[model samples]
Target: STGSATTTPIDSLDDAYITPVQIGTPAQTLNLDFDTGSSDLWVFSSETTASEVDGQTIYTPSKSTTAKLLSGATWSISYGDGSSSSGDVYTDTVSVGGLTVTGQAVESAKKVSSSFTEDSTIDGLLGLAFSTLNTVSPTQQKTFFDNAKASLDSPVFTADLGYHAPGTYNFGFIDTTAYTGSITYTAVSTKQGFWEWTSTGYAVGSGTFKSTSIDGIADTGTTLLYLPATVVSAYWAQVSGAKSSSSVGGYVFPCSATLPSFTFGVGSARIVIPGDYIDFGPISTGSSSCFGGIQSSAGIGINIFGDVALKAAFVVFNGATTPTLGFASK
Candidate 1:
């Protein structure tokens, strides 16, 4: 019964979140990104090809007619930022913001290797994780919120991710004026189908509140905020020219430093995270060094709370069946 989307944050360093798909049958709006760390919704089609950049917004399926072809299905993915993409698979009549889903599958690109053909403003990806972490094959498929989560009315979904501004990714209710205190629900594991949880401590900015628990994953297709390297090396040890250069790949710092605020804990809720959102962005071009949105998950073996602590909270994935995770702090 509900759906409302618009998450628009294209590169003002909130990095991704595009949403606005319509797909097939006299519909072809395509703008997707909505990833919740991974599942497979893929796009950029009409059989994609590579090697010469500048182009995007594809997805033809012979122009709708309720496109079908689930024929021999196929898919591939490689994320955690090693950027990959794969091909074939279909089923259509999808929609968003008003939620419609009839046979959704859709993975269609034929190949997308080089950072999505050098970032054509991504006209692909819509995974919201847990369709058993779908990566399709000869059979796996389902996620358009797992086929619109039981006709919704409330299986819950929310994201609010805003930093470079513009947010909202709801579905089936829960807008209490888009958050401000009181929501803490916890407990979610999805057994590797992600949205996995834990987190009950952390506090680097104003310090003192370390109780420790952390295990993570609430990734809206990640854009940095990976923890656990002694809690990000104790947050780059209070950042004053923080380093970690395997040729400067992870923590950088020095856009004239000052960054502090970082709290975290849920279910006693704290949530802070602001200090120019870890001062991340600006690692080149007239370099003042800067690039540390809290990195280091010991080389990606979990722990991701992504989008810089999900843009300071208002989460709620709650697609029940015993699932639970609702945060709130806007």
Candidate 2:
């Protein structure tokens, strides 16, 4: 079976992309962030403390006849940015796009960190990462994608993330019309529980492309592109008033600055992030400064090609015998 769903951007763009998902017997619909960065389909639920939940729509398991509790099972997870959630486990039918997975493990959040509490638009996170990364206790859980893959025609999904506009997440099949030009393929390493890949080189604007290989993961949940510190510094150096700000917590520059495009090699193909896309917009209201979407991933140890970089192209997450990434301009 094949299916598709529109992804809606949250806030100006720093937040997650929202996709509709149906859970349980009666199909309680919730808008979740299809995060490839983490594995665990945790959601704001009836178990979540009322005070801890904002305005998000919570999943009421009691309302679903098919919701079955996995007695004594629990889960807790913390994100790279410190957002976290923990709760009991329930088994139910979960459907996305049009593909349905019976007996999917759905983690119900009883406790959420301040970061998650503050975000009302995000009801939950739907992990698309490898099932090995699932965090359910007592027994590991499998993601909806993993559970439904065997029944799929091609066992693949495509991400066509766009800026300030609705994009799509196509499951079980790839729609060639979603992208333009030929798709350039690259081998991916899923050993680290991610769609990790290596870049042959990179270039800042019209500058020379440096032949420095960079290892990074393509993460849809992450909002910004993170690279090596030296590379981040080099790109910022070209911006007139850019600086590494302790207060802003990243590279910030004058909003009027004419930023340069960033390019990175994907085997024989290259994806160029336009200058306008690098400027993540104003830092705050009443300010003429902005934060660069590209930042240093020094402390993290691994670079991340986040939404800021991924939205520039059409991406195929192929889950065949030899998993691969196919990229093409949108």
Candidate 3:
């Protein structure tokens, strides 16, 4: 079986992307962020503190006959930015696009923090990472993708994120029409519960390619591309007025400054992030300074090739038992 759905950006900076997910019986639809960087699929629920609701849609498990309590199962997950959410668990039929999985672990948030309460764009987060990262206690449950992969035709899912337009997520099979050129496959390590891989190198615009291996994760959960400070500085140097600022705390440039495209290698393949994609947006309303989409991952610890880089190409999160990654220009 195969499935497909459109994922759309929620803000001008593409801060987050959400896709519709059908949970429980009668199918209550809620917008969810398909985050590959996390493995707990938790949502706002009737159990969530009313004050933390923040206009997001909630999953009312009590209303669904198919929803079953997972007795004693509880979960807590903390993100890279130091925000955390916790909840109890239930098993329900969860559907995305055209595929459905019965008795899927659906965590319902009972407690959340101000960081999450402030964002109403996503009702919850649906993790696409390895099930090993699942946070359920007493008895961990498989992720929706993990449960469904066995029945899928190709046991794969592809992400084709858009620069500004809506993009799509296709499961079980690759859509050749969505990308140009044949896919370049790369070795992926899931030991970290992530789609981690080593990039061959990167280039600033059309400058000379640096032949060094850089390890990082394909993190759709993150909004910006993060690399070593050296690489980030090189890219910003191409812009006449771009510089790391003390007040802004990262690379910033004049809104009118020219930006060079960023290109990274996956084995022998190269995907180019267009110049415009690197200009995240104005730092403030009507401000002349613009934030750079690619920033230093030094403080972040691990390099993250987030949406800023993914949006440049069609990416395949291959779920074959071997677990490889595929990239192709779109």
Candidate 4:
């Protein structure tokens, strides 16, 4: 989700939202967006003019003696959603709840766009989602979860997606309530940028696909699961009553009945995407349903299994230890 500084971080998690984590000192707490799209910690600066930093919460070094600005360190990041920013680096003893990671590298955005500059509800971004998808120094890459992973009681991390007001997206500890049995883990690819992963396999309600195939990496940056158009069309053909629709963009069949399941063919594992997400929508006949089925990307490019697909799986980036990724289902 790269964009200009004017591109604003999602201010509110209204439709389907993520709860931001509060950071900074006790007296001056700020609600910040925690993104897994990229690993970069940034907050507005106090020196930011009212026009550029208005409404958004800017961090002030004066408030905490421990806040240390990194000299000569410059950083910039672009979101896939078309937003970007450039700023200086700083180090501070950042704490979330009782967990505190000292000497943490944080960025201070200087040039911001109208969308970001004017956003009052958003203060900054807390990127603990992935350790490998960082927009910082090469040798010094770091993440909150990466730093906290060693100290945690378990080798797992879970996020409790916010559903109500003042939402809460928890990290560090794993939520054992969501899934049954031991979560299946996947080996991480050595690719740079985001921690790209391989799906164990794909599954529909009853249909299962087992072929070691490389999928794609994801975060909140994207909304749709992008797959090869032909691949998806071919897979859907397995359905008992499947029909391809040119108007609906691809296939539209009687998804109401028990549909075949799809699975990720990663290594030797066969991972299945849940049922309710199997069909597209509840639209009327000749209408498009928005079930969790895979769709064709406009062009043949890299396959992207977006949040809609990731939401059904639990992902972990082990950047702090080694360039590896762990995957399991919820």
Candidate 5:
């Protein structure tokens, strides 16, 4: 979505290609997980020190005077639920709501882990998800949606993300009133850096599950949608009485009964994921058997629909006009 010097075309609030990048400079907004399995835009630095990253939101490079650091440059990123975040590399003039965006690319991370900094609450992460998992070293061309997609007005960018509030990363176009019809595409097939997929099994309380199938990757980085243990005991043997909890591992039932309607076929677009979003609750680990947004890993066998099955839909990740994996509608 580019091409509008003005005079009639003005619709690109920069919606998709990797979004959510609002740093300092009268800026604070930060809601991006736009990963294509990895990249970088991190943010969480105000002398971090880790009180479990105390209260999240910390990006104060002295409140930017056009921040810049990259000296020596060092980074590290890991996630397969092992969850990690490294540091170094600075540079600001960043922003999100009103645009600004210059120099960009910021990650200070000092060592976040209070169980992965207690359920993400801003102050870090803006990686458009992948640019080879960027982590600094870049000097002139940082990408938080390729530097705000030509000043946006709509070329395509959409992310609604709600179910936890603090989730709404929109860009330029694609609000066709949330589409509501037609949109079923798939193609991106990475396989190793995690974006893998072959999925065609496991559908509890509504069909298919012969010993459970397990290929993987559809990860927006990480967030529950993982399965593999003969497909979680053949999908908790079709739900009724489902309970593997395994100390907050996976398979738990009774989100108030009547739960079942799974389908992650992923071939001709099956992806149904419902059951109260797989009923993953009681968060961290009170145990009481409440984790079912899919979980079993089975030693990294494969499964990651994360972000609660990615807010139910509207994921594109086009790879610049054709890598594929489009599924519109928010």
Candidate 6:
């Protein structure tokens, strides 16, 4: 079956985009982050202690006649950024866009880390990663995409995340209106439960292109582009006033600093990220300091092509026999 959903940026930080999803009978709608980095459809739910929740809307399964608890089953997930949520399991009718999935495993949160609890607006996470990465115990759970794949016209989904604007996430269908030119295809290695791929090479501004291959993940949940320390330093060196700052926890430069562009070679195609996109935002209200969206992926071994880089192109996530990622300029 073919279906699509619209995604909107989070108000405070355009770090992530969320789509509205309906769970259980009578349809309790919540804004959820469609993450490809992990596999677990979890929500802040009735099971969560009242003291733990801040301003997020909680899913009350008891109110849904179609909701059923999966006896003794539980799930816990921790993100690369240290955010986490754990809870019991439930099978219910979940709907996204116009597609409906019955007996979908919906993790009901019992506890959430401060990182999640403080988000206030993000009600839950809708995982789009492989089912092999699902966190439900006793028996692994299938993701919404996994359960709906059989009926899908094509086992593919598109992530068109925007820069402070609304974007679209399409399933079983590719909207030609979202991108320009043909989509370049790259093989994905899902052995690590992520959409991992290799970049052919990269260049900093007008500098000579380097041919060293860089392995990375296309993470929608992460906010910035994280690359190796050496690569990060090379790019910042092009900016006269840019320097690493402990205060900002990454590289920061004057608001008016002339920033250079970044380019990544994906297969035979080269995707360029503009200087303005790298200039994430100002450090403070009136501060002359600004942080670069591209940072050092020192702690994490793999590079991360987060929103900053992903938004520059139209991305396709294919789930058929040989998973592949297709990228094209927006």
User: Which runs of model 3 end up more than 4 angstroms from their true locations?
Assistant: none
The TM-score between candidate 3 and the true structure equals 0.98
Clashing pairs in 1: 37-221, 245-248
* 2 or 3, greater by lDDT: 3
Write model 5 residue lDDT over 1-330, tens digit each, in one string: 332111110112111122345665656555444554565777667756767675655777777667777687767677655767777777677765445667766778777655557744444555544354465553423566666766776434444444443344455554456546666665555434334546555566567544334566665545566676666677667767677755655567755555675666555455565666566554345544455666677776556666556656665544444344555445
lDDT score at residue 186, model 1, on the 0-100 scale: 90
lDDT of 3 at 7: 97
By lDDT: ranked, best first = 3, 2, 6, 1, 4, 5
Off by over 4 Å in 1: 1-32, 37-54, 67-118, 125-143, 146-199, 203-222, 225-237, 242-252, 255-282, 286-288, 294-304, 307-318, 321-323, 326-330
Q: What TM-score quantifies how close candidate 2 is to the native fold?
A: 0.97
What TM-score goes with each of the models?
0.36, 0.97, 0.98, 0.68, 0.33, 0.96
Stretches off by above 4 angstroms in model 2 are none
Ranking according to TM-score, highest score first: 3, 2, 6, 4, 1, 5
Q: Give the count of colliding residue pairs in each prediction.
A: 2, 0, 0, 42, 20, 2
TM-score of candidate 6 against the unseen true structure = 0.96
Model 3 steric clash pairs? none
Q: 17-56 in candidate 1: lDDT tens per residue?
A: 6878898899998888888878899898878884523478
Worst 10 residues of 6 by lDDT: 9-18
RMSD of each: 14.9, 1.1, 1.0, 6.9, 16.1, 1.3
lDDT of 4 at 222: 53
Give lDDT tens digits, candidate 6, residues 137-215. Answer: 9899999999999888999999998877888888898898889988999999999988999888899988888988889
Q: lDDT by residue for model 4 over 142-166, one digit each (tens)?
A: 7776766666665344433321222
